[model samples]
Target: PAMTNIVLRDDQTSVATKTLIPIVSDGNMSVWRENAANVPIDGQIKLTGQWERMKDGTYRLNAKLEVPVMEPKVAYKVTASLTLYAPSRSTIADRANAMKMLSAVLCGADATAGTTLSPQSVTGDAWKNSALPFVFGFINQAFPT
Candidate 1:
């Protein structure tokens, strides 16, 4: 298992359209791996993900991080391990309620159980053909409102 840590090159303060870069972690705050979706690197901080893709097509998920180094004396690298779940958007039907339930089902579990919660297992987005359905399922599950 690769323990992922996010850090900057001491000068790089921001990033763009990153598929989870070594941005920067400021504290022990849980990192949501899925939130890396189209997030922008603004200010002196950015979002990042740290995980190793296992041979079994699952990520041994780790912390999500933020970089707020621009502030004086308040800039320190950190990471927090948290559950990974996507919220629902307005365009989808019952998106809000679905995400809430899903969150309730998969949060604060241990590594043993965490291994079972694969990206594909929850969303079924591996085949590509069933991409929308898989995504929609999560959206509808977590944010059913």
Candidate 2:
């Protein structure tokens, strides 16, 4: 798949947004915000997905999202991730769709919603304590039933 860019919105009503560029190599895709010097910053919000075929005729897709936060004198990272399994015979398009859904969910959007949903705002201390749990809460909703 070709590399693509996505605009990660801080909120539905805020102008704060991050432009995430893709780094695609082999069967893995990672997207993250870059600095003005065009260098990838790992200490910010980032998303990564890895695709692999299992020996048991199943395809495994692992997706993860990370957010950096600071509280008083300490700084840390919070993350949410999920692994999906599909038949080995799943088509390229099928896998791509799965990735798209994973991205939406990681961004805190409703995977089934047509209209644009609010992406998680990683700013301020409002989400510092709840970021991981908030993101984990949406994992089950990322994939189809």
Candidate 3:
């Protein structure tokens, strides 16, 4: 299928009206192709995005990404929304990159069926609290928030 292109037409990123560029993915091509093949005819695999200039003149990007299933009857396999902040100079490409980064994390962090990441309800002045502190440190170092 040909990629369907979309633009943030009402984009007010600039004081003057400007036509923004299309959102494009930075890829691991073979992996991306595998997923693309599962998309039904007429389905799209585009990351769509829009930006707003915050009152302080910074940029806030709102993006939507939909994963398509091979079944024609299913509208979307999965969907995610992200709100990211950047400088006012950030372009459509920058917003798209953020979405791609987010997708990469989601792809890697599949939760195990019976496990959940629970927040710490109790916090103290003690430096060592978690049972697997070393593992927690490793995870934090590898995947910083």
Superposed by TM-score, candidate 2 places the C-alpha of residue 22 at a distance from the truth, in angstroms, of: 2.7
Write the residue-wise lDDT of candidate 1 on 1-145 in tens digits. Answer: 3326433222122222223333234443233232233333342344544455456554343434454433425545444334433323233445457555555344322324432233323233232222243233443454223
Where does candidate 3 have its weakest 10-residue lDDT segment? Answer: 26-35
| lDDT order of candidates, top first | 2, 3, 1
Worst 10 residues of 2 by lDDT: 125-134
lDDT for 103 in candidate 1 is: 52
Give each model's whole-structure lDDT: 0.37, 0.58, 0.44
Which of 1 and 3 is ahead in lDDT? 3
Clashing pairs in 3: none
Q: 1 or 3: which has the higher TM-score?
A: 3
- Which lDDT value does model 1 have at 142? 42
My TM-score estimates for the predictions, one after another, are: 0.23, 0.52, 0.31
- For model 2, the local distance difference test gives 0.58
Model 2: which residue pairs collide? none
Residue-wise C-alpha lDDT for candidate 2, range 1-145, written one tens digit per residue: 5767766555323346676667555545555443424333555567777777679889777767777664543278778778888897778888789878766655445434552333455444333223343254554343333
